Amino acid sequence: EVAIGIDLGTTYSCVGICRNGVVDIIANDQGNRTTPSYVAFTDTERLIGDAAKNQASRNPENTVFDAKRLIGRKFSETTVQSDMKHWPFTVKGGSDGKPMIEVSYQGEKKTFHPEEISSMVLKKMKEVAETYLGKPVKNAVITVPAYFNDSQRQATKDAGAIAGLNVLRIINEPTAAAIAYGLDKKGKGEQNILIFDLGGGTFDVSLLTLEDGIFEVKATSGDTHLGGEDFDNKLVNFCVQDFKKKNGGKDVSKNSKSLRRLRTQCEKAKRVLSSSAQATIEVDSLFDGIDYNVNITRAKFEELCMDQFRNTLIPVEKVLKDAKMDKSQVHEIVLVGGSTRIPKIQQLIKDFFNGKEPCKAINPDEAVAYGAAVQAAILSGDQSSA
Ligand SMILES: Nc1ncnc2c1ncn2[C@@H]1O[C@H](COP(=O)(O)OP(N)(=O)O)[C@@H](O)[C@H]1O
Ligand SMILES: Nc1cc(Br)ccn1
Numbered sequence: 001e002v003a004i005g006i007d008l009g010t011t012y013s014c015v016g017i018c019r020n021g022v023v024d025i026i027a028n029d030q031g032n033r034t035t036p037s038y039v040a041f042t043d044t045e046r047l048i049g050d051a052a053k054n055q056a057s058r059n060p061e062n063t064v065f066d067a068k069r070l071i072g073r074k075f076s077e078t079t080v081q082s083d084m085k086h087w088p089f090t091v092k093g094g095s096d097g098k099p100m101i102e103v104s105y106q107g108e109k110k111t112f113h114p115e116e117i118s119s120m121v122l123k124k125m126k127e128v129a130e131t132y133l134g135k136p137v138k139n140a141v142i143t144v145p146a147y148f149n150d151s152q153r154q155a156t157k158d159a160g161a162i163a164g165l166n167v168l169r170i171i172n173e174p175t176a177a178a179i180a181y182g183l184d185k186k187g188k189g190e191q192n193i194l195i196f197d198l199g200g201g202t203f204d205v206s207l208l209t210l211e212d213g214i215f216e217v218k219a220t221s222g223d224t225h226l227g228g229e230d231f232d233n234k235l236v237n238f239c240v241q242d243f244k245k246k247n248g249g250k251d252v253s254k255n256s257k258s259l260r261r262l263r264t265q266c267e268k269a270k271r272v273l274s275s276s277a278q279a280t281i282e283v284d285s286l287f288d289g290i291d292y293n294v295n296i297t298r299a300k301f302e303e304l305c306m307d308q309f310r311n312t313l314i315p316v317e318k319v320l321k322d323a324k325m326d327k328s329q330v331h332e333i334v335l336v337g338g339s340t341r342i343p344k345i346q347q348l349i350k351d352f353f354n355g356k357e358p359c360k361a362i363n364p365d366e367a368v369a370y371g372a373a374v375q376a377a378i379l380s381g382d383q384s385s386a
C-alpha cells in the first residue's frame with residue numbers, strides 16, 4: 001500500500017513520500033536529503049551512498065558511480081567509449097554486449113551489470129524510506145531522463161525489481177519536476193514549461209506543454225557532460241596552477257590522489273560560494289607534504305566558469321527553436337539540479353527570460369523525487385495532492 005518516489009540520479013538520488021497530500025523528502029542516516037549514487041566494495045564490506053563516496057579517493061578502483069551512463073547501453077556504444085576515460089573502475093563488454101563493471105570485493109574479482117549497481121542505490125533509497133516510515137515499502141515510481149530510450153527505461157525498471165520494488169511507473173524527470181510544482185493543476189489552459197536541470201554531471205533542458213492535466217515533452221536538449229563536477233574541475237585546474245606558482249613549479253596533477261583530495265575541497269568551496277562572497281580551499285599535505293591554502297572570491301569562481309555558465313543558454317535557445325516558439329511564450333521556468341543554486345546561473349536564466357523569476361521554491365536537487373512521490377501517491381489511489 002505504501003508507494004515512494006525515487007529520483008535515481010547520475011551523481012545523487014533522492015526519495016520522497018506523498019502522504020495526506022503533502023510530500024516529505026526523506027533524510028538518510030547522515031541527515032542528508034540526497035544520497036550519492038555510489039557503490040563501493042572493500043576487503044570487508046559493500047558501502048552505498050555517503051559511505052561509498054567518502055572513501056572514493058582511498059579506493060578508486062572499487063568505487064562505482066555513473067552507472068546511469070551505462071544502464072541499458074551496449075558496451076560498444078560511442079558514448080561508453082568516450083565516458084569510460086572518466087572512470088577509475090574497470091568496465092568491459094560481456095558476450096551479450098552488455099557492460100560488466102569489475103571490482104575486487106573481499107579479495108575476489110566480482111562483475112556487475114549497470115542495473116545491478118543501480119539496484120543497490122535503489123535498495124538504499126528504499127531502506128531510507130523504510131527507516132523513516134517504520135514499515136516495509138514495496139511500490140515506487142522511478143524517474144529517468146526524457147531522452148532515455150526503451151532499453152535504458154527497461155533496465156532502470158529491472159534495477160527496481162532487483163531492489164525489491166514493484167515499479168508502478170517510470171516517468172520523465174522534467175515531467176516529475178513540473179508535477180512537483182502543481183503546474184498540471186492550474187486553470188490557465190495551455191502552459192509552456194521550461195525545465196532547466198543542471199545536476200552533478202549532466203545538463204538537461206526540456207520544453208513541456210501542458211494542456212488538460214497532460215504533460216507532453218515538445219523538445220529536449222542539453223549537454224550530457226556539463227554539470228557541477230565541471231565547475232569543481234575549473235577550481236582544481238586553478239589550484240594546480242596556483243600551487244605551481246607557490247612551490248617552484250611542482251605539479252599536483254602528476255598524483256591522482258592529490259587531485260582527488262583537491263577536487264573534494266573545491267566542490268565544498270563551490271557550495272559555500274552559492275551563499276557567501278568568499279570561500280577557502282585548504283588541503284593539508286596535498287603533494288610532497290606541502291600544505292595548500294587559497295581564498296576564492298565568488299567573482300573569481302564566476303570568471304573561471306564564465307563560458308560554461310553562459311553556454312547553458314545555448315540548449316535553451318535550441319529547445320525553443322525545435323519547438324518553434326519564442327522565449328516570451330514560456331509560462332514557467334523550473335530550476336532543477338543542485339547546480340541551479342549557483343547565483344550566476346540563476347541570474348543568467350532570469351536575464352535570458354527578460355526578468356521572469358524562475359520557479360525554485362522546492363530544493364532543486366529534491367524537485368524530481370518530490371514529483372515522483374506525488375505521482376506514486378496518485379497511482380496508489382490517493383487523490384489528496386490535488
Ligand atoms: N549549494 C550548492 N551550490 C552549488 N552547487 C551545488 C550546491 N549544492 C549541490 N550542488 C551541486 O549539485 C550537484 C549534484 O546535484 P543533484 O541535482 O543532486 O545531482 P544529480 N545526480 O540529480 O544530477 C553536485 O555537483 C553538487 O556540487
Ligand atoms: N560532466 C561530466 C561527465 C563526464 Br562522463 C566527465 C566529466 N564531466
Ligand SMILES: [Cl-]
Pocket residue numbers: 001002003004018376377380382
Ligand atoms: Cl503512498
Ligand SMILES: [Cl-]
Pocket residue numbers: 132133
Ligand atoms: Cl513519519
Ligand SMILES: [Mg+2]
Pocket residue numbers: 007009199336337338364365366368
Ligand atoms: Mg535532480
